[PDB]
Write an enzyme that holds these catalytic residues in place. Structure first.
Site, PDB file in Angstrom:
ATOM      1  N   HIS A  41      32.114  44.938  46.884  1.00 48.85           N
ATOM      2  CA  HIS A  41      31.731  46.335  47.130  1.00 48.85           C
ATOM      3  C   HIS A  41      30.219  46.575  47.035  1.00 48.85           C
ATOM      4  O   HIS A  41      29.727  47.548  47.571  1.00 48.85           O
ATOM      5  CB  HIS A  41      32.523  47.311  46.250  1.00 48.85           C
ATOM      6  CG  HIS A  41      31.984  47.496  44.858  1.00 48.85           C
ATOM      7  ND1 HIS A  41      32.469  46.793  43.780  1.00 48.85           N
ATOM      8  CD2 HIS A  41      31.044  48.341  44.361  1.00 48.85           C
ATOM      9  CE1 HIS A  41      31.845  47.173  42.683  1.00 48.85           C
ATOM     10  NE2 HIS A  41      30.986  48.128  43.006  1.00 48.85           N
ATOM     11  N   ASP A  88      37.643  41.803  44.871  1.00 42.20           N
ATOM     12  CA  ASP A  88      36.315  42.392  44.851  1.00 42.20           C
ATOM     13  C   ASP A  88      35.267  41.328  44.456  1.00 42.20           C
ATOM     14  O   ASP A  88      34.644  41.414  43.396  1.00 42.20           O
ATOM     15  CB  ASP A  88      36.246  43.605  43.919  1.00 42.20           C
ATOM     16  CG  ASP A  88      34.987  44.429  44.149  1.00 42.20           C
ATOM     17  OD1 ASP A  88      34.255  44.138  45.117  1.00 42.20           O
ATOM     18  OD2 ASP A  88      34.648  45.355  43.407  1.00 42.20           O
ATOM     19  N   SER A 171      28.009  47.293  38.681  1.00 45.39           N
ATOM     20  CA  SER A 171      28.707  46.646  39.778  1.00 45.39           C
ATOM     21  C   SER A 171      28.180  45.210  40.022  1.00 45.39           C
ATOM     22  O   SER A 171      26.965  44.993  40.182  1.00 45.39           O
ATOM     23  CB  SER A 171      28.492  47.491  41.066  1.00 45.39           C
ATOM     24  OG  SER A 171      29.210  48.711  41.019  1.00 45.39           O
ATOM     25  N   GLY A 172      29.106  44.249  40.038  1.00 47.47           N
ATOM     26  CA  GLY A 172      28.834  42.876  40.444  1.00 47.47           C
ATOM     27  C   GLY A 172      28.407  42.007  39.272  1.00 47.47           C
ATOM     28  O   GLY A 172      28.219  40.808  39.436  1.00 47.47           O
TER      29      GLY A 172
END
Ligand SMILES: CC(=O)C1=C(C)N(c2cccc(C(F)(F)F)c2)C(=O)N[C@@H]1c1ccc(C#N)nc1
Ligand SMILES: *[C@@H]1O[C@H](CO[C@@H]2O[C@@H](C)[C@@H](O)[C@@H](O)[C@@H]2O)[C@@H](O)[C@H](O)[C@H]1NC(C)=O
Ligand SMILES: *[C@@H]1O[C@H](CO[C@@H]2O[C@@H](C)[C@@H](O)[C@@H](O)[C@@H]2O)[C@@H](O)[C@H](O)[C@H]1NC(C)=O
Ligand SMILES: CC(=O)N[C@@H]1[C@@H](O)[C@H](O)[C@@H](CO)O[C@H]1O
Length: 216
Positions: A41, A88, A171-172
């Protein structure tokens, strides 16, 4: 990270900042000198030719000579399904190879299929928002693996007795459990640090054969 603490500079030398025009937008993990892995994402609506992969960072507001900067040469995806919040994960192949040193190291991954039980103690980390702007200094956070309000398709975590969790910009980023990267930060529910919904991470152990096939 909300309710976390500053990490010791370079405590987590596999920790990566993905950046656009010098601004952090996502974390990633160095998994080989020429490969990082992040959340799918992070790059879904981003032109990867503009992404800079920043290794060896700690304080994003400072000029840091420990840093190494790469561009993205190739993307490997694994069936990211945003409708079902699944897979993801993405691997970004760099345009050269990192120089491994005190400030830049390759993370260790778990065995394929290794699950984490309820109660596993992990460290989440990242440069994401500090309240429910983005952190200058890398943050870390003690979290606990939970299965309630989680699917078997995620590793989820929860801090008890207070509101704390991952947030936008995390995120990530890796989730480190028992010395291995067991998670990639994927999504929150109820806003950051709800104290109700556990944070969801892509379950890195499920993707290990796929990772290994790419990085060697
Ligand atoms: C699209 C997007 O940008 C989304 C973001 C940042 N997040 C998000 C918000 C705060 C923290 C995180 C974190 F967990 F750190 F990755 C993720 C969502 O919760 N929701 C979105 C999201 C993120 C991942 C997946 C999946 N799979 N589906 C939706
Ligand atoms: C690999 O890439 C490094 C950084 O490239 C810079 O950032 C990217 C996103 C582009 O905007 C690009 O124009 C910038 O130069 C380089 O400094 C480095 O030389 C490259 N290494 C190679 C080609 O071996
Ligand atoms: C808070 O977390 C500290 C560091 O966690 C440990 O090392 C990291 C890298 C991961 O491997 C993680 O799984 C380990 O637990 C611990 O040293 C400390 O005990 C933790 N404190 C509490 C109360 O959970
Ligand atoms: C990587 C790290 O800091 N791990 C520590 C470990 O060394 C220690 O035995 C324990 C004490 O509670 O906390 C955890």
């Amino acid at each position: 990270i909300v309710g976390g603490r500053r990490a010791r500079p370079h405590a987590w030398p596999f920790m990566v900042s993905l950046q656009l025009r010098g601004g952090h937008f996502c974390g990633a993990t160095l998994i080989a000198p020429n490969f990082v892995m992040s959340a799918a994402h992070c790059v879904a609506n981003v032109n990867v030719r503009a992404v800079r992969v920043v290794l060896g960072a700690h304080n994003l507001s400072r000029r840091e000579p420990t840093r190494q900067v790469f561009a993205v040469q190739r993307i490997f995806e694994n069936g990211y399904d945003p409708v079902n919040l699944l897979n993801d994960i993405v691997i970004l192949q760099l345009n050269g190879s990192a120089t491994i040193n005190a400030n830049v190291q390759v993370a260790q991954l778990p065995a394929q299929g290794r699950r984490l039980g309820n109660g596993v103690q992990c460290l989440a980390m990242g440069w994401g928002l500090l309240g429910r702007g983005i952190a200058s200094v890398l943050q870390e956070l003690n979290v606990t693996v939970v299965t309630s309000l989680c699917r078997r398709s995620n590793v989820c975590t929860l801090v008890r007795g207070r509101q704390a969790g991952v947030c936008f910009g995390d995120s990530g980023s890796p989730l480190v459990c028992n010395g291995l990267i067991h998670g990639i930060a994927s999504f929150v529910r109820g806003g950051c640090a709800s104290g109700l919904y556990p944070d969801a991470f892509a379950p890195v152990a499920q993707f290990v054969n796929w990772i290994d096939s790419i990085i060697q």
